[PDB]
Scaffold this active site. Sequence first.
Site, PDB file in Angstrom:
ATOM      1  N   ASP A  30      -7.452  -7.769   0.249  1.00 40.38           N
ATOM      2  CA  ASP A  30      -6.639  -7.820   1.457  1.00 40.38           C
ATOM      3  C   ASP A  30      -7.499  -7.398   2.630  1.00 40.38           C
ATOM      4  O   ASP A  30      -8.384  -6.551   2.487  1.00 40.38           O
ATOM      5  CB  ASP A  30      -5.417  -6.897   1.396  1.00 40.38           C
ATOM      6  N   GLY A  81     -11.565   3.646  -1.424  1.00 38.94           N
ATOM      7  CA  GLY A  81     -12.640   4.400  -0.812  1.00 38.94           C
ATOM      8  C   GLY A  81     -13.823   3.584  -0.354  1.00 38.94           C
ATOM      9  O   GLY A  81     -14.867   4.165  -0.045  1.00 38.94           O
ATOM     10  N   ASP A  87      -2.244   8.178  -3.224  1.00 32.72           N
ATOM     11  CA  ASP A  87      -3.445   8.973  -3.435  1.00 32.72           C
ATOM     12  C   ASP A  87      -3.776   9.760  -2.172  1.00 32.72           C
ATOM     13  O   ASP A  87      -3.100   9.648  -1.145  1.00 32.72           O
ATOM     14  CB  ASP A  87      -4.619   8.090  -3.871  1.00 32.72           C
ATOM     15  N   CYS A 128      -6.593 -27.726  12.347  1.00 30.67           N
ATOM     16  CA  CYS A 128      -7.771 -28.583  12.448  1.00 30.67           C
ATOM     17  C   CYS A 128      -7.425 -30.058  12.336  1.00 30.67           C
ATOM     18  O   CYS A 128      -8.250 -30.900  12.718  1.00 30.67           O
ATOM     19  CB  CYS A 128      -8.787 -28.174  11.382  1.00 30.67           C
ATOM     20  N   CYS A 133     -12.215 -28.157   7.356  1.00 31.04           N
ATOM     21  CA  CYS A 133     -10.986 -27.427   7.089  1.00 31.04           C
ATOM     22  C   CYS A 133      -9.792 -28.363   6.994  1.00 31.04           C
ATOM     23  O   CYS A 133      -9.636 -29.283   7.798  1.00 31.04           O
ATOM     24  CB  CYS A 133     -10.751 -26.406   8.199  1.00 31.04           C
ATOM     25  N   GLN A 175     -11.028   6.349  -7.219  1.00 30.70           N
ATOM     26  CA  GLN A 175     -11.732   7.009  -6.130  1.00 30.70           C
ATOM     27  C   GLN A 175     -13.056   7.551  -6.667  1.00 30.70           C
ATOM     28  O   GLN A 175     -13.496   7.198  -7.765  1.00 30.70           O
ATOM     29  CB  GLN A 175     -10.857   8.100  -5.498  1.00 30.70           C
ATOM     30  N   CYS A 223      -6.617 -27.382   7.285  1.00 25.61           N
ATOM     31  CA  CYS A 223      -5.407 -26.767   7.818  1.00 25.61           C
ATOM     32  C   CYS A 223      -4.782 -27.620   8.921  1.00 25.61           C
ATOM     33  O   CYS A 223      -5.414 -28.506   9.502  1.00 25.61           O
ATOM     34  CB  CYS A 223      -5.690 -25.353   8.323  1.00 25.61           C
ATOM     35  N   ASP A 249       0.845  -1.180   0.000  1.00 19.06           N
ATOM     36  CA  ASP A 249       0.000   0.000   0.000  1.00 19.06           C
ATOM     37  C   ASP A 249       0.888   1.239   0.000  1.00 19.06           C
ATOM     38  O   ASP A 249       2.036   1.197   0.449  1.00 19.06           O
ATOM     39  CB  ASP A 249      -0.917  -0.019   1.226  1.00 19.06           C
ATOM     40  N   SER A 250       0.363   2.343  -0.526  1.00 20.93           N
ATOM     41  CA  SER A 250       1.171   3.521  -0.813  1.00 20.93           C
ATOM     42  C   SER A 250       1.327   4.468   0.372  1.00 20.93           C
ATOM     43  O   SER A 250       2.186   5.358   0.326  1.00 20.93           O
ATOM     44  CB  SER A 250       0.561   4.277  -1.992  1.00 20.93           C
ATOM     45  N   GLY A 251       0.528   4.303   1.423  1.00 23.03           N
ATOM     46  CA  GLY A 251       0.592   5.149   2.596  1.00 23.03           C
ATOM     47  C   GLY A 251      -0.578   6.093   2.740  1.00 23.03           C
ATOM     48  O   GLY A 251      -0.775   6.644   3.831  1.00 23.03           O
ATOM     49  N   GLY A 252      -1.380   6.275   1.687  1.00 23.30           N
ATOM     50  CA  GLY A 252      -2.403   7.311   1.714  1.00 23.30           C
ATOM     51  C   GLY A 252      -3.467   7.081   2.770  1.00 23.30           C
ATOM     52  O   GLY A 252      -3.870   8.010   3.477  1.00 23.30           O
ATOM     53  N   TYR A 253      -3.932   5.841   2.900  1.00 22.56           N
ATOM     54  CA  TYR A 253      -4.996   5.553   3.855  1.00 22.56           C
ATOM     55  C   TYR A 253      -4.497   5.653   5.294  1.00 22.56           C
ATOM     56  O   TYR A 253      -5.164   6.257   6.145  1.00 22.56           O
ATOM     57  CB  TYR A 253      -5.587   4.171   3.570  1.00 22.56           C
ATOM     58  N   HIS A 300      -5.337 -21.009  11.301  1.00 22.24           N
ATOM     59  CA  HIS A 300      -6.601 -21.534  10.808  1.00 22.24           C
ATOM     60  C   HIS A 300      -7.356 -20.490   9.980  1.00 22.24           C
ATOM     61  O   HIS A 300      -7.874 -20.803   8.895  1.00 22.24           O
ATOM     62  CB  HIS A 300      -7.493 -22.020  11.953  1.00 22.24           C
TER      63      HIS A 300
HETATM   64 ZN   LIG Z   1      -8.504 -25.144  10.131  1.00 26.32          ZN
END
Ligand SMILES: [Zn+2]
Lengths: 369, 369
Positions: free
Chosen positions: A266, A216, A142, A309, A304, A189, A306, A93-97, A335
């Site tokens: 993300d 946004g 931005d 689990c 699941c 935006q 993973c 991310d660019s830093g704007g938020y 998990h």
């Molecule tokens: Zn799991």
Amino acid sequence: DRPRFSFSIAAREGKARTGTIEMKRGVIRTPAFMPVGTAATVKALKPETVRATGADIILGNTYHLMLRPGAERIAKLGGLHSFMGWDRPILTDSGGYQVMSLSKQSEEGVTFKSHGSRHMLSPERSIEIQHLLGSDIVMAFDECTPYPATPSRAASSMERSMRWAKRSRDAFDSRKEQAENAALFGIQQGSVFENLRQQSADALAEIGFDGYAVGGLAVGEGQDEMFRVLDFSVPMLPDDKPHYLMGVGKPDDIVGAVERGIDMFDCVLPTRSGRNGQAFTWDGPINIRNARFSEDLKPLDSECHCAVCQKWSRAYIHHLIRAGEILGAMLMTEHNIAFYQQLMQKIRDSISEGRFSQFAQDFRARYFA
Amino acid sequence: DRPRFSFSIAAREGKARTGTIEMKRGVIRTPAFMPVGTAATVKALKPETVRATGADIILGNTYHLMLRPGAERIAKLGGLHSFMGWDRPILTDSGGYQVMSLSKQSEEGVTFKSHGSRHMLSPERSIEIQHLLGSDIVMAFDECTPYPATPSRAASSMERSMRWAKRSRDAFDSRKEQAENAALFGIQQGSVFENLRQQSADALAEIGFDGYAVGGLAVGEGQDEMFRVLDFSVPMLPDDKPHYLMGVGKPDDIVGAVERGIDMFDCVLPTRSGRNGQAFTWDGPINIRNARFSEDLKPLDSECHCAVCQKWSRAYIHHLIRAGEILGAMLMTEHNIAFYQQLMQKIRDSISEGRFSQFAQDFRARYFA
Ligand SMILES: [Zn+2]
Ligand SMILES: [Cl-]
Ligand SMILES: [Cl-]
Ligand SMILES: [Zn+2]
């Protein structure tokens, strides 16, 4: 041998797409979920564990890393990949938020106080910081405005963001090593206004980017409004480039966003809410601290795949989280990230097979039952 | 096929011994270091990681587990091994030290308030709790007195501890499943007084145990005094059974204790001080938070074989710990436990090869340089 950035759409169903982004450090299967690795770590996970869950790419933050440990320092130590031990693609991310969210605005950029030293960010400085980090996907810098934004604050932030998008493009192209090895995404935006979203999309397409984010959103507008804005905003973006919805989201948010043409996501939810005791399951989220799990020998989720689990019970993880044990955060986080990756795999497979509409209906009926 | 408890001494050098304890759930190489797993977890490590560092056995705590999650509950969930995912031997402390340390005394036992419900512990109840946990090495329940103890408080606590040792022996032998599958250790008391240590050793040897702990040390007496007490106390114990020094200690404490006949150790130092930023190296401990490590690309220790030192720099771990990141605690803890296990391996090999005296001298010269 590997290309800098090659997006291929292998299959479509309605507005949804599935395919791959090939980059020098690896392939990204889309739709993709990026675990968030704010301070050069995906919280409570080794990078090998992040990879084991199925993640193809992680997200880092220009704003946090420029403050700690510092961008020039990370570059001196060999770049972000070497520093943290993740050798696959990284989007920054660019830093704007975060500048708006956590920390003086002008046409040149923004000065701010660290969450208390003073620092500067501009399109050119953001691109240079991301170059120093060694990011694979660089985000244009931005200017964000808080939600709910007036129509005036929306249009003014958007047009400045578009002027900053051209400056970001030029700074990126001016750095040969960056332009040859990384990709650059622009950010649409315009808040909830269809005409501003169109003006933003047109400006970004005029400049030309490797991918296009929808900015946004995920700022407190609710799912109905987010979906309504995605309905008209995503078709405005170039169809042949990836579409990235920043900061989203809950599993049902992701499914609905894919139904509307989003390829990349993300969110801190699986990591953050994992540490707080929330585990995602195909029958909806559960809070493992609840007393009802104290003697429950089943895994967090019955299907699941993973490693958590396969080995540990709800009862054990309940005990760990209630005791404040680090292993509780580790197991919940692994998990949840694995659950998110399995969701993305089921989305990719169902689009490839032309049954994503049915998957979305089956998913929602069970998840909200 | 595997025996309940078989101690074999393969080699000796002076008072030091090296060998094996065979048990149903695995072999313990001695001298052995037991990572501490207080609340059914070795803090910040999966059990597979604990095993990967070289640990053969871990320690659990009767006092903590009886309060949370509860001994009957753990038994209902299948026992401590299944609950936490560690299938190798577990030694459980009996509760005597933590009752004094963290929480009404009589000949029958002790009542106390949890650190605030009220609970009871007696030799019989301690043995039953350890049976419910499924401990492989059960500790006799004793009565501890704080340090520095008067000679009167030392003799009275010791003689009661010996009466409680016989009661522990009888309760253990009364439980067929425990007596057939687990081992029982007695605890020598007597503080810093040679005649009381002798009376304690004689009483424990009269009863008969599988192993003998030296209690009442590592309570703030300093290394010189601890070594002085070990000098006469360990030879009082049966030579053909393991000798366990509870709560010790720093790497140099361990080396000197092995030189005096100790076979087994436990300590929270590698885990706790790892989370606090202290890393053990062959050149002594370092605090990774120190600014001198901010750009240091070397591993925590230049010779360490652990996975942390194969992959990550001091600079990265410095950043993690200063940022309060969970991965910092994970990596520091894995390295420190691996360092302790490598120390034990070097001790075992040097005794086997008849060069432990030289190893101890070389170790101390470099570690305190
Ligand atoms: Zn799991
Ligand atoms: Cl997070
Ligand atoms: Cl600890
Ligand atoms: Zn190491």
